[PDB]
Amino acid sequence: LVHVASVEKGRSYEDFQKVYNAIALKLREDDEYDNYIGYGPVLVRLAWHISGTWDKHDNTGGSYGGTYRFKKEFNDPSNAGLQNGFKFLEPIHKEFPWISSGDLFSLGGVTAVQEMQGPKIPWRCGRVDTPEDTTPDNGRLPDADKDAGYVRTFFQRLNMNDREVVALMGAHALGKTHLKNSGYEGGGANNVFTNEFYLNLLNEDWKLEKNDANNEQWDSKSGYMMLPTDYSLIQDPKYLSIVKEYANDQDKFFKDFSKAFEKLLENGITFPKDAPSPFIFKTLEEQGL
Ligand code: HEM
Secondary structure: OOEEOOOOOOOOHHHHHHHHHHHHHHHHHOOOHHHHOOOHHHHHHHHHHHHOOOEOOOOEOOOOOOHHHOHHHHOOHHHOOOHHHHHHHHHHHHHOOOOOHHHHHHHHHHHHHHHOOOOOOOEOOOOOOOOHHHOOOOOOOOOOOOOHHHHHHHHHOOOOOHHHHHHHHHHHHOOOOOHHHHOOOOOOOOOOOOOHHHHHHHHOOOEEEEOOOOOEEEEOOOOOEEOHHHHHHHHOHHHHHHHHHHHOOHHHHHHHHHHHHHHHHHOOEEOOOOOOOOEOOOOHHHHOO
8 A cells, every 4th residue: 555745736845834834833822722831742742643543564544644634533532632733733724725634734743843942853745635434443542551562562563663662752751641631640741842751760759659540650749740651661671771861862862753753754655756855944933933
C-alpha cells in the first residue's frame, strides 16, 4: 500500500508559512484553555495520535489520509480530549481550505512545538485526504499502564528504536493528564518545551500511588506525575542510559526529538524524488510578529 505525497496545487513555502502563522497567532490568542496552559500541548498530542496509528507491516493508518476527521477515529477512547485540538484547528481549515487534513494536523504539532520554544521541526507537505473506509480501527495507540518491554515492542510497529522512543517521550514535559480523558490525575504542568521530563524522572522522589480512577501512577511531592510507561524508562537499563543523556544535554535532546518527531509525522508517506525539500518555518518571534 503506497501513499505518494502530492503538493497542494500551486502551493509553496510561503503558503504554508501563512498557515503556520495563523495557528501560532491563535495559540497566542486563545491563552485561557486548560487553566492557561493554552492549546500547544493538545496540538502536539493530536499530531502524534493521528500519526501513531501507523502500522509498518501494511502501511495502514498514519498521518497521510487525515482520517481523524472520521467518527470511528475521532471517537477512539485513546483520543479522548483531542476534540479540543480539532476544534482549535477548525477556523484555520476554514481560512485555508486548500490544506489537506493530514497536513493541517501534522503542521499543528510542528507549530506548537516551535512556538513553545522547542526545536525546529522540518515539515513536508503533500498528505492527501483518503476516504472513510481507510480509517484505522481503534486500539492502535499505546496503553499507559504497562512496562518497558511493552513500550519497546509497541514502538517497533512505528519503526522506532530505543533512542527514538525515549526522545519522543520527552514531549511529556508538556501539558497534563486529565482524569476524565485518560484515567490519570494531572500534576504540575508547563507549556514551554524543555528536557525537564528527563530531569524530573531522575531527580524527583517518586511514589507509586492510586488515583481517583483507581489507576496507579507515580507522583512526587513537588506535584509532578509519571505514567507507568514513563517510569519504565528509568526501570529498563537501556532506556535509563538515554534518559540520563537527554537530562544532561538539552541540545542533543532537541536534535533527536526533531528527527524522531518528523519521522513519526512522515511514516507511511512516499516522497517523490522531485518533491520540495522539507520546510523550516520561522516562529512568530523570529518574524517580529
Ligand atoms: C507509551 C507511549 C505513550 C503513552 C502511553 C501516552 C499516554 C498519554 C496519556 C494517558 C496522556 C494524558 C491524556 C489526557 O488525559 O488528556 C498523554 C498526554 C500527552 N501526550 Fe502522551 N503518551 C505516549 C507517548 C507520547 C508521544 C510519543 C507524544 C509526542 C511526541 C506524546 C505527547 C503527549 C502530550 C503533549 C500530552 C499532553 C496533552 C495535553 O496536555 O492535553 N505522548 N499521553
